[PDB]
């Protein structure tokens, strides 16, 4: 159509460079591209054919349809962060992979879970974290791993690890490829936090010693 051109038989038709096509299994003596403007491109191996589609404008509409989708359901997550209802906020921040908003939805849902009253979040949120697949739970535990390295943000990470452990299958969690380099990374952080909170609760009994002194006062 003016200036880019097709060539054959690397094992494949290639256009001018960009867009290595599917090709074949072996060699090739074939190009017929000569319908209307530049329509159906027949490209043939020894036996197998391909009838390559059309002017390549189909992909751009598909390419321009995702960005519109992502900017649409980015302005649903902000509305959910505004008005609460943290479950679709959770799964949609998992879909967008927005990490500090994920920390915010888990932290404020955890704070209101501490507020009101087996279940550690609201039950619709922990079934929503129960029904998520391997890629989502492995990235969720990637960032539970890196949240667990603090002494401040560790509790949200520990309770997300807890609900994953009690809402998924343990053999499945082991067989997911990648989740043995994560749990090795954040077992010893849980160990030092356990020693620190155990030391804190053992030095918590000066209140009890002060009570028994205050009772021996009279």
């Amino acid at each position: 159509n003016k200036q880019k051109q097709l060539i054959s038989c690397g094992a494949d038709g290639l256009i001018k460079c960009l867009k290595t096509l599917d090709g074949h299994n072996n060699r090739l003596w074939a190009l017929s591209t000569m319908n209307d403007g530049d329509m159906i491109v027949s490209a043939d191996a020894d036996g197998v054919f391909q009838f390559w589609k059309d002017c390549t404008e189909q992909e751009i509409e598909e390419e321009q349809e995702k960005a519109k989708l992502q900017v649409e359901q980015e302005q649903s997550l902000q509305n959910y962060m505004s008005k609460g209802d943290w479950t679709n906020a959770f799964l949609l921040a998992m879909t967008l992979d927005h990490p500090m908003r994920l920390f915010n939805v888990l932290k404020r849902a955890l704070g209101e879970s501490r507020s009101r009253q087996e279940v550690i979040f609201n039950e619709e949120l922990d079934q929503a974290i129960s029904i998520l697949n391997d890629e989502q739970l492995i990235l969720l535990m990637k960032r539970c791993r890196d949240w667990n390295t603090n002494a401040k943000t560790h509790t949200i990470a520990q309770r997300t690890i807890r609900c994953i452990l009690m809402h998924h299958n343990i053999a499945k969690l082991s067989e997911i490829p990648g989740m043995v380099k994560i749990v090795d990374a954040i077992i010893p952080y849980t160990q030092r936090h356990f020693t620190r909170v155990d030391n804190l609760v053992e030095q918590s009994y000066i209140l009890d010693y002060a009570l028994v002194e205050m009772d021996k006062l009279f």
Binding site: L96, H98, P99, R143, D146, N148, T149, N150, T153, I186
Partner: protein, 43 residues
């Protein structure tokens, strides 16, 4: 294990632990994190 940098490019991962995404940061925090990265490069 220690929190390095992000394995993506639309993400910013501080050594604190707080991973931020560039699509979710506002422009104020984008300028602020860029200046803070300039300080940590300059030292």
């Amino acid at each position: 294990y220690n929190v390095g940098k992000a394995e993506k490019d639309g993400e910013i991962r501080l050594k604190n632990g707080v991973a931020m995404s560039k699509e979710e940061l506002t422009r104020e925090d984008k300028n602020r994190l860029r200046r803070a990265l300039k300080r940590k490069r300059s030292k």
